[PDB]
Design a binder for these strands. Sequence first.
RNA 1: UCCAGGUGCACAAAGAA
DNA 2: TTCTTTGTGCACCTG
Length: 596
Amino acid sequence: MVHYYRLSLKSRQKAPKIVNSKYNSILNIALKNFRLCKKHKTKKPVQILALLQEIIPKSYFGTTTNLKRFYKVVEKILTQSSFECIHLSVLHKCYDYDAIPWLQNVEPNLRPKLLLKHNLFLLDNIVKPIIAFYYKPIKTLNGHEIKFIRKEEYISFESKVFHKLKKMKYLVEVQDEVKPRGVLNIIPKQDNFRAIVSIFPDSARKPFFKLLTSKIYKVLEEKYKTSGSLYTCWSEFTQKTQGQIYGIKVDIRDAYGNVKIPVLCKLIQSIPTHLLDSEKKNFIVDHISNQFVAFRRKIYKWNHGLLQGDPLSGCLCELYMAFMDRLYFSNLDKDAFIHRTVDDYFFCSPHPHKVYDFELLIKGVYQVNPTKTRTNLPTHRHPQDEIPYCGKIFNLTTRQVRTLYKLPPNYEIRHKFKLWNFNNQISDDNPARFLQKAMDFPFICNSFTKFEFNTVFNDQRTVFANFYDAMICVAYKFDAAMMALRTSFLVNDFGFIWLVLSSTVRAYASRAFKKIVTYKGGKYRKVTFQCLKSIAWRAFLAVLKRRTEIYKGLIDRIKSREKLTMKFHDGEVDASYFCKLPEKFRFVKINRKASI
RNA sequence: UCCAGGUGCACAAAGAA
DNA sequence: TTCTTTGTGCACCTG
């Protein structure tokens, strides 16, 4: 009932000096060359695929096509996403079983199982360990993307941050027998570092922490201004402001690290007893005053504010700045708009001098990350009307809000989707459901909110553009699912794939249509379900044309038997936007190749 | 690499309308 | 028949 093989380097294991008696002695030559590869320091940067050629004897594979079939899996490992898997059958299907020395005298019925075991041994004892020996995987948190840095380069970066974290008394070694709550992880950031704790799995005390966080969040919501959702705040502010809107988004640098613990402790003590009792108040003060982490098998005390990665840090930091915001945001003039999501501030006002004061005001209290400041103030260097905030883009001139997409140049779009669930496993003989399951609404439901489809401040042009951009992501996930499945799947099951494609367009168009009518505003003029279908089809056309050759049969049924014209009553629209891939998605990379 | 919040969608059992 | 509670899981988003 096990169909998947995880590509994660965490699922590897150590290799013994000799090979288990279960397997063949041909893994001895693989093991011996593995240690010899580890003993020579690198005279130059290495290529994993080109270097595995010397640890694995061609003897194990025989013909070149067997060797190339195995290393296709290795290439997937070298360029993996988080939680990515492959079908286990890939390791033992379509091999030339009679063309290898070590399965010549063996029964034909059993050896497909034998090759599967031996391939697993190489992947788990040789392939993954040699990758981990040379590179450290870093998750960029832009989807499931993983980047591999030289571990030699990472250790040097880690040591420089570690010594600086000690020079400044942010990290102090303790001689006391405390036990650390987790391991300290130094995460590389552009021209910066982020120090986090990888909390140890503590399931026995998890419900207690959920109780503590819930108590804090109610203290927050009943004594602190819950003005409303960002949606209500923006719609109300835009409707009451006629003139040009000025605004700024500014990023606090290290909000958690600049929380002064003694101030936070006495905020916690000041909480009324009926909202939080004494034994829980003392626990939280003790918890945040003694933050111990393990680093290079030594124990250290984190001495700079709240420690990121701890379960309580998120709500306690939010509690700290809700108190700080409240004295300043209660002086807010009637004309202003203010919203804060953790460590990002969004402030708008018809008076530019009010906005300009806010920027310096925050810069005077907190340290600011200036590379992320976005504003339309003419006083600044590089003003712009479009401001990203909380996953959306706000246009201060047109008041239009639009979805934001973290798609850097050369980003592999497949990193944004999780196709493989190790907990529900799907047979390799059933690519039908694998594709159907991948067409699940939640992966894009954050682009289907009241922000994207309203007509109270958003024009019909923006609603269509939001829907089109969302359907581009759906089409890219469809392409990623096709590439994960076998090459034959497309033309044998073309009829099934078409029905899945057609059903997907209805469901997303119907979901968008229902969301639009519920949030009708003064600008809703006429959107028809057919027009939504046309936009969704064109989104698939723009994406499928990146591989016209493979998807031509699909592209032709779309043109031949689907209406691609778009009847929208709105006249200030631009139909050209729905004719090609948008600027964001045009430059995403769609081909997988090993770079290390 | 970790954590808290959210947006949802599915599911089933039970106990009512 | 249909709805409404309690769960469960799972895939995305925000910092």
